[PDB]
């Protein structure tokens, strides 16, 4: 007889069951300046 | 003596099954966010520096 690997929920499913992930939210939020702003430019007058 | 007999044997019914489990995965969809970053900066300009 052969037993296949069977499980109700995977690690990915359990981790994604969370409504919010702090890691992903922080990752997306801290890229805000690199995307919607110019970090390097300096304006002097 | 009366020798014992085999059991009746289980009456097995062939069929097709779909097994459902409780859904924990959130309902996902695509949304679009419109907003405005308003940044007001106060600067003090010194003799040599700002």
Q: What is the 3-state secondary structure (H, E, C) of A1-45?
A: CCCCCCCCCCHHHHHHHCCCCHHHHHHHHHCHHHHHCCCCCCCCC
Q: What distance lies between CA B5 and its chain's CA centroid?
A: 53
Name the residue among B21, B25, B37 with its Cβ closest to that of A17.
B25
Quick check: helix, strand or coil at residue B40? coil
Which chain A positions have a beta carbon within 8 Å of B24's beta carbon?
9, 13-14, 17
Interface of A with B in 3-42 (CB under 8 A): 8-9, 13-14, 16-17, 19, 36
C-alpha distances in angstroms, A24 versus A21, B28, B29, B48?
Answer: 6, 15, 17, 43
Quick check: helix, strand or coil at residue A38? coil
C-alpha distances in angstroms, B16 versus A15, B13, B45?
Answer: 31, 10, 80
Q: How many CB atoms lie within 10 A of CB A16?
A: 15
C-alpha neighbours within 13 Å on the C-beta side of residue A27: 5
To 5 degrees, how large is the angle CA B31–CA B37–CA B40? 170
């Amino acid at each position: 007889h052969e037993f296949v690997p069977l499980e109700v929920y995977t690690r990915h499913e359990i981790k994604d069951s969370g409504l919010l992930d702090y890691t992903e939210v922080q990752r997306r939020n801290q890229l805000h300046d690199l995307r919607f702003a110019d970090i390097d430019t300096v304006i002097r007058a | 003596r009366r020798c014992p007999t085999r059991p009746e044997g289980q009456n097995y019914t062939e069929g097709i099954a779909v097994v459902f489990k409780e859904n924990i995965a959130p309902y996902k969809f695509k949304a679009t966010m419109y907003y405005k970053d308003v940044t007001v900066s106060q600067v003090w300009f010194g003799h040599r520096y700002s």
